[PDB]
Design a protein around this ligand. Structure first.
Ligand SMILES: CC(=O)N[C@H]1[C@@H](OP(=O)(O)OP(=O)(O)OC[C@H]2O[C@@H](n3ccc(=O)[nH]c3=O)[C@H](O)[C@@H]2O)O[C@H](CO)[C@@H](O)[C@@H]1O[C@H](C)C(=O)O
Ligand SMILES: CC(=O)N[C@H]1[C@@H](OP(=O)(O)OP(=O)(O)OC[C@H]2O[C@@H](n3ccc(=O)[nH]c3=O)[C@H](O)[C@@H]2O)O[C@H](CO)[C@@H](O)[C@@H]1O[C@H](C)C(=O)O
Ligand SMILES: CC(=O)N[C@H]1[C@@H](OP(=O)(O)OP(=O)(O)OC[C@H]2O[C@@H](n3ccc(=O)[nH]c3=O)[C@H](O)[C@@H]2O)O[C@H](CO)[C@@H](O)[C@@H]1O[C@H](C)C(=O)O
Ligand SMILES: CC(=O)N[C@H]1[C@@H](OP(=O)(O)OP(=O)(O)OC[C@H]2O[C@@H](n3ccc(=O)[nH]c3=O)[C@H](O)[C@@H]2O)O[C@H](CO)[C@@H](O)[C@@H]1O[C@H](C)C(=O)O
Lengths: 420, 420, 420, 420
């Protein structure tokens, strides 16, 4: 139905405000199920479709969720007896909805959640979630495409994660905060979203230590209460605008940006010639006249974030030389590069390596997004392409970016969103 | 808004008729553009959505195409001056539509075809097509997501294909049949569809030698005429039914099956315990009581066909042990296995290897197809799952299978196609 | 304790003679075990260490082998009762020595051959050899690092190879020529060495059809006799000199070169700017002033030979741009590129891809070969490096090249072989 | 010259003492170059060949090194003017010798170190070392296979490591401790060896903060002095004995073992059925009657250490089912599994994944080690193989294990080391 039309050749200048983090708000909404009494109030909630889906998931568990979009605020009342079922209708749209499994085990000792199927970008199975829950004393059945977890008594244990899975970390944390005794998670996810989740759980009465470090220690408690919490800024939306500034000879202040949440991206953009400055008001990015090539390798935090990879390929594809990207977190997250061949991108892909030759002008063309970050990457490429770029499948964009086109317009970009 | 409902536990018995090959009919329809005079009549044309799309592509080049579905017959009149443009509207639906580029170069010396974008299953770029056309004297421009190829005079040359690409082979053959002098294609595609294409071109007045071998030799001619041609049987539809018989303790005759077009699959099914017999009337497959594990590696013909891989994983997942599949032709063609986790499939994926443990019962669940062959694989899995399987996204199935559910019903399978 | 010293800066000019093929002579020596009566005489046998090793292997089976090095000729008398044991002392030096297993099964119905261990360049297991032998009626035991195969009666059967393994193809052919009835090998190796092996077996009284094609058919016979045979020219030694000419602005005639045995290499060198001509006396290679980049993908014949890959990286590393090589036949055959970093080669490796930037001068340095073809590649790099290159571990070079330095001197190259 | 002979079937019982860490002692020896005045005394130095090589490297820089093997003690006097050259004679034996580059830059502002060549197990280039040194103000030339780094004034800077390279981390830390101002290394190596290096540097008068965390901060100082330091226990030698106990139904106390240095291995061995207990005297491992399969993925610390991978495959290969290992740190570190096919190991390898079927008895055979940890893994496999295992290339074992056979004998293992 809709497309974003982009003309290139304009420098981005000004200030940009950033929404609260998609990847923090979804687990924190699930965390609100832990409050047996009181009203949870979340501030700085972004208006994204994944938030609407998660709000539906939670309502279907017998919970009142009001989203005041104007105030960017969600109130949750989970004080009634919860239902325990999250069907494929919701999990098929968004597999993040499975992080309700942990709170449901803590509250009810029972959860019945649809097994996620395929993802475009080539996701992992939920094996590490289940490993965690089994370690805490849960029995796991599968029938009719559902995972049913039952635990009369959750008991703390030592759990080693083979990979530092963000999702498994979140799911297990939220079960363990009400398990009897000590839980220790080794090789936890260290991402800033984990820290924000830990911060709210602690306010709710939990005891979570070492969030953001290699080892997390959780002391179980009997009762959790509701609190007010402001979602941390979205480091990926921030980073997307940092790339946009760096590739357009821009001068853009990302308001209240937390630089410690983008150490990799900042370092890499500086290697490509950008000047990046921490100021009282946020992080300023000044794009160079000559964009220099650099190689990028994605890894679990604190390495380079996979959620910045697609956006980063856009600037690598206009750099003056050959750049390489290696994706070690996702199996099939180069589909945007396949599309950008329509825009005359010279790129060779083999397995989880892509080789980009940026000594070619990008050309406007009609292009279809394949996933959330691919949509942003195609728009960014449009900022530097010659002619007119038309980006479609904006359903993907809306999952993670609010008012992307308007924020870009306000920075001087020639970007419209229109009907076909 | 349709689904296939499957109950497992039934043995397949009887005879099944197979349609003409999807992968032969699409390039042969393009080949019909070469006939400057006469009416081309194609018989044994399958009723698939890709055929409808290809018929539209060809009409938009100023050609009359009539499809009599009842007779499985298409007449083509390409005797008027051709237009040269194939837009993204069609190429985005089906990238096979680019094989019109070759005939357009031969007839007009001009072609303007949309550059294909991303494919779900992780396709190659069209670099080898363009390499071929440049070798024959074509200039190539890109603008607005179109490849424009201009050739005043096509001149035969020696062309080495880095990979034995079926599509590049087809596109180049069809340009070269009207080039001046000799063309030699080294490391050509050897697939049976190439042979059928060569067979019709030869009847049309062309001189193509060595089709099906490692080296193809083409002597250019001035004029090609229209002919009647019956499309070769679909070896992949045939093979799909061979797998179904082998996994259900079946006894199924695949009518008029060409066994030399399934040497790999036949050999592998026999390794898994099947008895397979060439008869006057076709190939009979008798499924064993104990399905034995086997490993599979996809390769260009004459190795194991990637188009049989998804179907083959279905039988590997009910074999009595661990089986391994290695996909060396496509990057991301294991998404069906991600879905089959909903059906309790125990499978580990890393890169282009998948490890399947078949000592677990499959379970019915709602499952969404991701691509043509994945849809067939999910139905086949349903035949052996306990409970009710519901397969969705039948738009993918209809691209390559005609009346799949009816043919299965006629073999004793409990399969319905119904509205939601 | 020898080294080759190379100074760069000279163009190669002249004629080069090529030895008989290492990869044909080793299996054909094994084939000579099949002759129960008579003296086998092989001509055009190269003086390489692998030939000396194979001659030892065969003597230990109670056979007389005389190597007249001056005449490049080996006589074999295998008319006595054969011993059946080939120990790890020999197989650990050279795993090609296992192709005696096939002839031993045909003559004796018994073979006891050491299981090969690891290879530097990352070889396959011998699973496909054993699959073939089991298919013909052989029982297989493993004990104390030996494979023991017993077959009272070999019986012809259909055998599908999952990969077109040269070694498995050779081993199975040589067992099957004396099996009762018809044998069919599907997805056989198509390499020219297979053809030469088939050619001698046929002269010896066997019936081997379709060698060099996708399907091989063998009709078993009761008796085989000894013959005279001239080994086919070594296409890899030939190809090595073609690369040397192409990278040094050379003009070199490779005497009596069979161009159909280097279709991929010839095509790729022409893509890099070389002019290559079939003449009465052989194949002439004329190197361009400007060496152009090209990408290379190794595959089973008829694709680009892995045995030419290392040599080809040498010319790719001096081409005017970025080139990519993809090795799909061996796991770890880029160790030469790791060494060439000492020569200032700019190359990035990930998995089975290597990315070479040739817009940098190579520099002479002391470098150690890691395997046969790496040794040749380092010498070739020396031809274009600035300064003095010293190549060591010439034990690897002598496995596959006879008088490499002298042949290069005769073409005008500044190459000496000296003691340390 | 020598082999280790192993008979299987015996349970390991007793206490084992562990040497100081190879991977700490080598960089700490290099660190001793920073002391311009005084005598450095290192305690708990293991008697390994890498220590002898490193001692030679350091002497050639005009330094006195005395190794009292009986006291496990090394004194270093680096108070004279240092020479700056480390030739290929030493770097070709052991690429760890390049970590002298950092201290040489700090002391002299000049270093001339041979570029490492190929490694068997498929190492990285030294790009990240050079990136670090360039960031601190060093000029880098390559000529004749040497890297020459010159820096009149080292100046602190922010450095992001694309990969958390242990070697690059060590080299950069040792330069930065004497750079002017603040250095910040982001995505540093977190390994315990880094911590021990930091601990000695701090005692020597340096200011290194955040060792073991994601970010390291270094404040430059003018002068460093000599100290006494006891090398931390070798966590890999410790872990090797933990595996040996776990696979032999053993009961072994690893004296003074630091469990926080083997969180991954301990967790994984417990998943395989072992009982592991922290005691006053160290860590006790009790091997189960039934060894259970588990999957293993190597990663930078704090994930599963690649230096434990080979040893771990030995226990995975006798577990009661199928296990998978994924090696994400090194490209070609599965060569031991290629050898263990001689011992009847059923294993499939593809890329950086290996699939092990442990429902087969291992068999003794002659087997050749390919690298340090492969040698240990083959001995461990011998402990469970039936018959006699003979492990050769003990030159590799001696690089990292002191008196391996004697420590195993003392635990009740049937292990001899003898001449051939
Ligand atoms: C929404 C979603 O499914 N994935 C998103 C995020 O969800 P989050 O709410 O933090 O948690 P989860 O959904 O429960 O977890 C994500 C799903 O994928 C597995 N996983 C988890 C962590 C990891 O590192 N790798 C990995 O594969 C995990 O098992 C679960 O099934 O987790 C990923 C972590 O890398 C993000 O990259 C991704 O962000 C998108 C892409 C973007 O912004 O571009
Ligand atoms: C839709 C269709 O007909 N495609 C099928 C047809 O290829 P073809 O019609 O010749 O192919 P193209 O799309 O016209 O070729 C253009 C596009 O296809 C890429 N390509 C083509 C050939 C090849 O070997 N490898 C390869 O990657 C090329 O890089 C470009 O993106 O036949 C092949 C085997 O015979 C199938 O693998 C292929 O997949 C169908 C769906 C299936 O499952 O049955
Ligand atoms: C000498 C050698 O080791 N093999 C060489 C030779 O095989 P050949 O001598 O005829 O055959 P075998 O070794 O007797 O074959 C038995 C052994 O070789 C493994 N194998 C065999 C075939 C194959 O395709 N792949 C493969 O891995 C099998 O797993 C077993 O260990 O010729 C092949 C192509 O003609 C080369 O690719 C190969 O490279 C050489 C080094 C080169 O650079 O010259
Ligand atoms: C030579 C030696 O002693 N090797 C050890 C170590 O050396 P280090 O003290 O870091 O000295 P360097 O080799 O000069 O290190 C520099 C070079 O080493 C590579 N590197 C280094 C770090 C890393 O994380 N990964 C990585 O690959 C890369 O090539 C780099 O250029 O490097 C590895 C670190 O992961 C260790 O696992 C390895 O231990 C052995 C195997 C064992 O005990 O089994």
């Amino acid at each position: 139905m809709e497309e974003i039309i982009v003309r290139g050749g304009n420098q981005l200048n000004g200030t940009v405000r950033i929404e609260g983090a998609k990847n923090a708000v979804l687990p924190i909404l699930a965390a609100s199920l832990l409050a047996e009494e009181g009203i949870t109030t979340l501030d700085n909630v972004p208006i994204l479709s994944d938030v609407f889906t998660m709000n539906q998931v939670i309502r279907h568990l017998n919970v009142d969720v009001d989203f005041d979009e104007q105030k960017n605020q969600v109130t949750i009342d989970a004080s009634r007896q919860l239902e325990i079922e999250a069907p494929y209708e919701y999990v098929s749209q968004m597999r993040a909805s499975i992080v309700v499994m942990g709170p449901l085990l803590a509250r009810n000792g029972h959860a019945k959640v649809a097994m996620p199927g395929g993802c475009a970008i080539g996701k992992r199975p939920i094996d590490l979630h289940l490993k965690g829950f089994q370690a805490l004393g849960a029995k796991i059945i599968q029938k009719n495409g559902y995972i049913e977890a039952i635990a009369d008594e959750l008991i703390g244990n030592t759990i080693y994660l083979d990979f530092p899975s963000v999702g498994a970390t979140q799911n297990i944390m939220m079960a363990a905060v009400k398990a009897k005794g000590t839980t220790i998670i080794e090789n936890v996810a260290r991402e800033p979203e984990i820290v924000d989740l830990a911060n709210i759980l602690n306010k709710m009465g939990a005891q979570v230590y070492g969030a953001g470090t290699e080892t997390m220690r959780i002391e179980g408690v009997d009762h959790l209460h509701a609190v007010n919490h402001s979602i941390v800024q979205d480091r990926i939306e921030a980073g997307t605008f940092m790339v946009a500034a760096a590739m357009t000879q821009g001068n853009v202040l990302i308001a209240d940006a937390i630089s410690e949440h983008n150490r990799p991206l900042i370092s890499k953009l500086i290697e490509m010639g950008a000047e990046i400055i921490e100021e009282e008001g946020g992080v300023r990015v000044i794009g160079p006249k000559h964009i220099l090539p650099t190689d990028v390798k994605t890894m679990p935090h604190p390495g380079f974030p996979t959620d910045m990879q697609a956006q980063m390929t856009a600037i690598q594809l206009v750099a003056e030389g050959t750049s390489v990207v290696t994706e070690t977190v996702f199996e099939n997250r180069f589909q945007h590069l396949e599309e950008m061949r329509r825009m005359n991108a010279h790129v060779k892909i083999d397995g989880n390596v892509a080789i980009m030759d940026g000594n070619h002008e990008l050309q406007g063309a009609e292009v279809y997004a394949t996933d959330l970050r691919a949509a942003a990457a195609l728009v960014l490429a449009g900022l530097k392409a010659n002619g007119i770029t038309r980006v479609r499948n904006l359903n993907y964009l809306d999952r993670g970016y609010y008012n992307f086109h308007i924020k870009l317009q306000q920075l001087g970009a020639d970007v419209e969103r229109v009907d076909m």
